[PDB]
UniProtKB/Swiss-Prot annotation, chains A, B, C, D, E, F, G:
Changing H131L: 16% of normal hemolytic activity. This is Alpha-hemolysin. Changing H35L: No hemolytic activity, reduced oligomerization, not toxic in mice, no effect on ADAM10 binding. GO terms for biological process: cytolysis in another organism. GO terms for molecular function: identical protein binding; toxin activity. Alpha-toxin binds to the membrane of eukaryotic cells (particularly red blood cells, RBC) forming pores, resulting in hemolysis, with the release of low-molecular weight molecules leading to eventual osmotic RBC lysis. Human RBCs bind much less alpha-toxin than do rabbit RBCs. Heptamer oligomerization and pore formation is required for lytic activity. Coiled coil: none annotated. One of its GO terms (cellular component) is extracellular region.
Length: 280, 280, 280, 280, 280, 280, 280
C-alpha cells in the first residue's frame, strides 16, 4: 500500500494518460466442450520501461460428469472432473517475458482454543482440559503452478466434498467395508448400479456444470526489440477420474482411480506489438 | 484486480468515452404467466476489437403453487415449481458469439472444527474426541448450465427446505411411515386432504410469489461482418412437480413425482448492429 | 456486477446528460387513516429506446391496533393489522407497460451444523451424534405478488412474534388448553378481559404504529405513441384480524379468525408524458 | 436501491444546481429544561413541482432523574423519564403538507436454532431435542407515532433495563416478595430509604443525562398558493413515572406508577416561503 | 440519512463556497498537569441564517495515579482519577448561543437468548428452560450531561474494571472479608503496604496515562448584533478518589472514598466575530 | 464526525489551496541498532492562525533477543526487550508548542454474559447460575505518556505472552515449583542451560525482530515570533530485562529481573521555519 | 491518519503534480528455480527534500517439495522449503539510504475468557471455574528482519501445519514412538517408504507450488550528491529441510533436520538517478 509509505495513492500505478487498445477472442472446442475466451489489453506508457499486455483467460470448462459404464445391475462406472488446469506458455525462442499474474498462492490460518476447568462437588475435585482447532476448507483449491519466465499455469484440484450431510469424503478416502463413498446415493441400496449415484444437483456445481476460470497474466517486450511479433499458446485441460460401484452381495462398495483420462485444447495466438493486435 | 497487478484501476476497462444506446423491450406471456423483460446495451468502444451487446434478462416467472387435484376427502394433489430456467441461443449460421456472462458457478466452503478433551474426576479418568461440520444451504441454487458459443442458460433448482421449523426436507426425502413430508401441514390430521397442505406464506417466497431472474450475457460480433444483423432466441422454461397426499389409514402419506410438467415461452428478437437497435 | 464483465462501471446505466422532471403528490385518507404519497421522476433519454417514469409509493398505513369489542368482564375482542398491501395497475386499453418493480423476492439460507463425539470412561464407551439447524425469522416479511404487464403489487404479511420472551406464536398457533396465545397478557389472570391484552408497546411497532412502505416501479411508454395520456391507480390496503379472549372458569383462552376486515383506499392519477407532469 | 433499476445513482434525487438557504433557531425552556434546535433548509428546485422545507428537530430533553420527595426513613419516591416525545403539528387551515419523515418504523428480527442429539452408552440410548431463540432488546425504542397530513410525531419509550447485571426488569415486572425492582439498589438493605436508589451512573444515560433527538420532516407547499406563509407548532415533552419503595419490616418493596407527570414545551414558528426564512 | 428523503447527499449541509478561519490556541497548566488545546473554526456562510463557530476542545488530562500517602507497613494510601470532565460556559448577558454539540448520549442494547431442551433416557425424562443475556460494558463511560443554552459539559466516569482477570470491580463493590479490592495486588500479601497496589501498567491506560478529549461544540451569534465580542470559558476539572489499604492482621482490606479531591483550570477565551479571531 | 453537525465534510480541515514542503531524514545508530527516521511536513495555511509542522517518527528499533551469558549447564541468562519508547522534547525556553499527536489512549470494552438454568428430572429440580466475561488483550500495549506542552512521548510495554500454547505468562508471573516460566523451552529437559530457551520464532516478532514505530506529532509556532529557529530532540530509548533459568535439583527454575539495561539514542534536530527545512 | 489531526487527507503525502518514471526488470534462475522481478518508480517531487525511489520485489520462489532420497523400502528422505527469504542491501560505500518498507512487524492479540458457575441439586451444590484463550496461528508467518541503513530483508518461516486434521505439527514436535509426524501419511502401513508421504496437494500450497513475494522498499538520495550512480544487490533464498521416515518393525518413525540445504540467488542492479533508470 502506497498510502502506508506516505506516497499518494495511485502514484506508483501505471496506465495514466495512455490509450489502451483492448480486444477479445472467443473460441469453442466442440470435442472437449470448453468455451475458450481471451480478453487482452495492450498498455504502452511512455514513462514505463517496456510495453505491457494483460491476457485474461476467462473461458469456461465443462464439468463432464456422467455415468459411462452399464455393465449391468451388479457394477457400474462414473467419470467426474478432478482437476481443471489452464496454462499459458511462450516459445523458448521468443524474447517476451512473463512479468506478473493473478491469483497467487496465499497463506491459510487456523483458530486454536485451549481450555481448562475446575470443579468441586458436594467432595469431588474433577478437572478438565481441552484443545479445539478450527479452519475453513474449500471444496476445490485453486493453485498456481510454479511460474517460470516463459510459462505460468493454474490448477483447481478437488479438495473434498460433503455427501448427504456426512463427513467430508476425500478423493483417497477409504472404508474397510463400504470402500470409498465419494458418490454413493445409498449404502445398503437395492436399485440398479447405474441408478445408485449421487445426483449431480446434490454434488458441487463444478463437477457437473463446469468451471469458469478468471486468471490474469501480463507479458512485456524490450521496447527496442528487433522483432515485434511473438506467438503465445494457451492450453486448457480437464483431468477426469473413474469412480465405480459394485455389489459385494451385502452392500455397495466403491473404488476410485486417479487421473484416468485427460484432454487438452492447445490454442495458439499471434501477438503483433507494432500494430497492437493479437488475432488468431 | 488491476490494482493488485500494479495496473491503475480501470485502465483495462471497456466502454470509456463511447456513446451507448440502450432499450427496454418488454413482453408478457399471459398463458404461462411469465412477465419477461430484456434490457440491452450497445457499447461500441472504438478501441475494442469487436462490437459489444449486453443483454440483461430481467423479468419474473410466476410460482404457480396451487392445489390442482380434488379427487376427494381421502386424496389430493399439489403442483409446485421445481426449477426456473432462462436461456439464450443463436442460430448456427450466425457469426455473433457469446463472450461473457456475470452469474457463474462459485466454490463453496465448510468450517471443520476438531476437538479433544480429557479430564480426571479425582480415582477416575475421561477422554473425548469430536468433529463438527458447518455450512450454509440455500433454499434454491442458481447454477449455470454448461455454456457454449451461441448458447448460454441458467437454472434455479430446488434445494432442501424447512417447514414447521423441523428438519429440512428435499425432493427425494422419504420416511417409511409418513413418506415425503415436504408440504405436509399436519401428520395426524383429520380435515380434508386438499385443505391439508402447507400454507404458501409459510413456504419460501419463490414457490408462491415467483422468481425474478437477473442474469447478464454479452454478445460480440465482428466489426466488418458481411451482414450486420442477427436473430437471438430467449426462453423462460419452468418445471413443476406433482405432490400427492392420501390417507393411508391412521396417518397421512406424502408422495412426490419429479419433473411432471414444464412450461416454455420462447420469443425471437432481431438485432440490427448497424442501426444499434433490437426488435422483438 | 457490471464491472465483472470488464465493462466500465455505470456505462450500461441510463439517465446521464438528461434532465429529469421530478415531482411529489401527497394525500391523506382520514376514513382509513393511511397517509399516501407518490414521488415520480420522468427520465427522458435521447439514447434510451423509450420514455421512463419511476414511481415511488412511499407513505404510511396506520396499524389500527385496538380493542374493538367489550362484552362484559368475561370476554372481549381485538383487531390488529394482519397484512399491509399496496398495489399499482394500469387500464387494459393503455399502451404503457411496467418495466421494473424493485424490490423483488430473495432466496433464503440456513446454516446446517453436524456433530459427532466419542468417549472413554474409567472400562466404558460412549457415542453421540447430533445436528443443529439455524435460520433467521423476520417478524414481517415483504412479498412481491406475481407482477403482470399492467399491474404489480407488494404485500407484507405477519410472521411469528415473540410474546413475553416465549416461543414464536405464529398466527395459526394452537394450544389444547390455553388456545392461541398470540396477544395474551396473562394465562391464569383475574383482571377484566378487555384490559387483559398485550401492551402495544411490548408488541411489534408495525402492529400499532403503522407500516411505511418504500417500493419503486418504473413504467415505460413508446416514444412515438399516438396517445400520450395514460392512467394509474395506486391502491393501498390493510387486512385486519379478530383476536378474542374468553374465560373458561379456569384460565383464559384465545382464538383468532383470519381476514375478518379489509379496508382499501385507491386514487387514480393521470400521467401526461408530453407535459412530463403527473396530477392526482 | 436506485441503481438496481439500471438508473444512474442520484438521477432521481433532487436539489441539483440549486441554492438552498439553510438556517438555525435555538431556544431553551429553563422551566422544563428542554433545549430546542430547529435547523431547517429551503430546497427550491425549478424541476420539482413543489417547494420543500426539511425541518431538523435536534435539541435535548433533560432526564430529570431525582428523588422528588422522601417521607421518613421507611418511604421515598423517585421520578424518572418514562418516555420522550417530539411532535410537529401543522394547523389544518394551512395548505402545506408533510411529504416525508425519518426515522421510520423498522421490522424486527430474531434467530431460531433447533437441535437434535442422540447418543449411546455402554446401552442407555438417549435422545435430546432443544431449540433456542435470540434477539436484541434496546433499552429505549424509537417508535414513530402514526403520521398524518398535518401532524407527525415521534416517541421514545422505556423497553427495559438490566439492574446490577441481573435481570432485565421493566415497568410491568412484579415479584410477590420484593415487588418491582427496577431501581432498587439493595434488597435486604438497612440504609435510609431516600438513599436506597440505583446510582444514576449505573442506570442508562438517557434517564438522568437526557435524550438528544434527531428527526426530519420535509414539508412541501404548492408553488401557486394564494398566500406564501404557514405557521407551524413544534412540541417537546417527557412523561415521568413515580417509583415508590417502602420497607415491609423484612425487606424493601418497590412499586411503579405509570405516566404520573407530563410536561409539554410548545413553540410556534412562522414560515415565509417567499422570503425563504422562518422566524421564531 | 439525508439521502433517504430523496434529497441529494450533501444538499442540506453547510459551509460550501465559503472561507473558514482556524486556529490552535494551546495552553498547559503545570500545577494541574492537563495539556489544554482549543481548535476553533469560523464559518460565515452567506446563505446561512447566523454565523457559526466550531470549538473542538481536544487536549489531555493527566491520570495522576500514585500512592499519595505512606504511614507505615500497616496501611497506605492511593489516589486515582475517578472521573474526567470538560465544559464550556458563556456569560448570561451574552447573546451567543450553543447551536449543536457532539458526541451525544446513545441507547444501549442487549442480546437475550432463551432455551428449552427435552430429553429421554434408556424411563427418565428431563427438561431445561435456561435463559441468557449478554452485553458489552466499557470501563469508562462518556456521557454528555444536560446542556443548557449557555453551558455544555461532558464527563468520563469510571464504570468498572477487571483486576487480575478476577471479575469486574467498581467503586461500590464490597466483600465482607477483603472489602473493596479494586486495586489490590495480592489478598494474602506479606510485602510493604505501599508495594501492594496494582501495577499501573496492568491497570487501564486512562488511570495513569491520562484522557484525551475530542469533544466539539458549535456557537451561533446573530449577524446583525450590536456587540460582536463574546467571552467564553472552558474548564478541565478532574475528580480523584482515595483507596487507602490496610492490614487486618490476617488479610488486606481495601476501602474506597468517593470524590476526595478535585482540581480545575477554567481558562477564559475572548471571541471577536468581526475579525474572525479568538484570543487566548 | 464533522458531518453529524450538518457541517460539510472537510470544511473545518486545514491544508486547502496551500503548498507543503515535506522532507525526510534517515540515520542509523550502529551502537544501539535503531534505524531512526523522521518525516516532516511544513504546512502554512494563510487561513490558519499559526504555522504547522507534523513530525512522523517512523524509524525502527531492533529487538536484541539473545542469551547474553552462559555458565556451564547449571545456569544461563537471557536479555529481551521489555519496552520500546520514543519521545520528542523541546527546549524549556523555546516558543514552539506541541499541539496534537495521533496515537492516543483509548477506552477498552469487555463483554459480559449471565446464564440462569432450571432443570427437572424424572424428580430433582436443579438450578444453575453462571457469569462469563471475555476481553481481548494484546501482547504489547502501546501507551501515551502524559504529554506536556514541550515534550510528548509514547511507550510500548510487554502485556503478556502465550508460551507453548499454555496459559499466558507475564513478567510478574510466579510458580512455586518452576518459577517464571515465560521463556522456558522444557519444564524438566536435560539439555544444556543455554540451549533450553524458547525459540525466537515461537515468541512474538517484536521481541527478536524489533519494533517499528509510527507516531505523529504536530508542532505549531507563532508566525510573528522574533526568532524563526527551533531545536528538537528525539529519543528512541529501549529497555531490556534479564531472564535467567536455574537447575535446582530436577527441574528448571526461571527468574526475571525487570528493567536491567536501558539503551538511549538521542539526536538533536534544528528547524528553520522561515526556510521551511528541518535539517540535522 | 491526517484526518484525526484535523489535517486534510492526503495533504502530507508526496508524489503530487510530478511525473514518476516507472519500469520493470524480470529474470529467471534455472538452477534455483526462483522467478524474480523488481518493479521500480523514480518519484522526483520537487517539494520533497530528497529524490525518492520505490523498489518492489515481486516474483516467486519455487516450493521444491519432493522425495530427494530413496534407500530401499526401509527408509527414504524428503526435502521441503523451511523458509523463503528475500534481502535487499546497498554497498557500504554508497550514500543512498533506505527510508521505508511497507510490510512490518505487528502485535498479535488473544481473546481471553473467564467462567464461573454455581449449581444446586435436589441436596448438594457444586462450583466450576474456567479459563479459555483463542488466537489465530498462520501456517507461514512473514517476519521483517531487523532493518538498518543499508540492508533490509524479510523472511517467511514455517509456523504450524495440520496433518490429516490431526492437530498442528511443527518442526520441533516429537512423539516418543512415532516421532515427528509432520508429513507422515499413515502411522503404520505396508507401502514403500517413498510412497508413504503426505500428498503435496493435501499440504499447504507454499510447500509444493511456491511463495510469491510482494514486499516494498524506499530509497532516498541527497539531491546534491557528487555522483548519481548506486549499485544495489537483490538476494533471494530458500532454506530447505530434511524429513526422513524409518521403520521400527512395528510403525513408521519420522525425523526432521533443520536447515539442511540453503540455495540463494543474488542479482546486482545499477541505478542511474540522472536518467531515472535502473538498467540491470
Amino acid at each position: 500500500a502506497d498510502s502506508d509509505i506516505n506516497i499518494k495513492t495511485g502514484t506508483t500505478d501505471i496506465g495514466s494518460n495512455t490509450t489502451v487498445k483492448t480486444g477479445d477472442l472467443v473460441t469453442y472446442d466442440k470435442e472437449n466442450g470448453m468455451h475458450k475466451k481471451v480478453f487482452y489489453s495492450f498498455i504502452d506508457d511512455k514513462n514505463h520501461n517496456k510495453k505491457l499486455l494483460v491476457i485474461r483467460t476467462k473461458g469456461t470448462i465443462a464439468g463432464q460428469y456422467r455415468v459411462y459404464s452399464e455393465e449391468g445391475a451388479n457394477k457400474s462406472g462414473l467419470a467426474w472432473p478432478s482437476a481443471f488446469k489452464v496454462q499459458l506458455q511462450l516459445p523458448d525462442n521468443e524474447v517476451a517475458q512473463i512479468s506478473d499474474y493473478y491469483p497467487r498462492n496465499s497463506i491459510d490460518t487456523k483458530e486454536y482454543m485451549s481450555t481448562l476447568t475446575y470443579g468441586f462437588n458436594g467432595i469431588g475435585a474433577n478437572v478438565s482440559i481441552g484443545h479445539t482447532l478450527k479452519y475453513v476448507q474449500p471444496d476445490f483449491k485453486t493453485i498456481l503452478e510454479s511460474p517460470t519466465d516463459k510459462k505460468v499455469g493454474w490448477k483447481v484440484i478437488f479438495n473434498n466434498m460433503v455427501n448427504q450431510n456426512w463427513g467430508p469424503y476425500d478423493r483417497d478416502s477409504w472404508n474397510p467395508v463400504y470402500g470409498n463413498q465419494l458418490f454413493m446415493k445409498t449404502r445398503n441400496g437395492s436399485m440398479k448400479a447405474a441408478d445408485n449415484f449421487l445426483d449431480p444437483n446434490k454434488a458441487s456445481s463444478l463437477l457437473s456444470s463446469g468451471f469458469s476460470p478468471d486468471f490474469a497474466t501480463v507479458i512485456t517486450m524490450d521496447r527496442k526489440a528487433s522483432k515485434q511479433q511473438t506467438n503465445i499458446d494457451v492450453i486448457y485441460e480437464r483431468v477426469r477420474d473413474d469412480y465405480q460401484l459394485h455389489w459385494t452381495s451385502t452392500n455397495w462398495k466403491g473404488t476410485n482411480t486417479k487421473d484416468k483420462w485427460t484432454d487438452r485444447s492447445s490454442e495458439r495466438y499471434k501477438i503483433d506489438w507494432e500494430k497492437e493486435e493479437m488475432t488468431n
